Design a protein around this ligand. Structure first.
Ligand code: MG
Length: 134
DNA sequence: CGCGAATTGCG
DNA sequence: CGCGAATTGCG
């Protein structure tokens, strides 16, 4: 399998797991930032990766783009394809925002179709995903 | 740490 | 014993 350069890559920037979560999606070739989510005060890295993929799906659907999405998170890819985020994060006032976003992303998946291929970024083969925060 | 996949007590 | 609940590599 080879890299599809005409694609979108997503990744999460964490400050702890659980901890603050942000994410972005970038053009795999150029690095152009296409969308970003401001820091969510608490969530898990997995929840962030899930939100990042779904955000990418919504972005690409709006623009009628057929570009694939790359994610380095096998867990998030599975959650998106299952249309179910199997997170164990406690639901309380502290985590209300991340769970609101996750619940809404699930609702979107369960009420829409999409053509975007969702592909695993192979870090061991290809180096850093283009959306990496460092 | 959180995940999926795997391995490990009370009916 | 079964069936699951809970425990035990990778990022
Ligand atoms: Mg990541």
């Amino acid at each position: 399998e080879e890299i599809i350069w005409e694609s979108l890559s997503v990744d999460v920037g964490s400050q702890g797991n659980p901890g603050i979560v942000e994410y972005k999606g970038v053009d795999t070739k150029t690095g152009e930032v296409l969308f970003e989510r401001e820091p969510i005060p608490i969530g898990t890295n997995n929840m962030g990766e899930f939100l990042a993929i779904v955000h990418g799906l919504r972005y690409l659907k709006e623009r009628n783009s057929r570009k694939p999405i790359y994610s380095n998170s096998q867990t998030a890819i599975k959650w998106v394809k299952d249309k179910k985020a199997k997170s164990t994060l406690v639901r309380n006032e502290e985590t209300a925002l991340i769970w609101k976003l996750v619940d809404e992303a699930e609702e979107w998946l369960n009420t829409h179709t999409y053509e975007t291929p969702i592909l695993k970024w192979q870090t061991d083969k290809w180096g850093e995903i283009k959306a990496d925060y460092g």
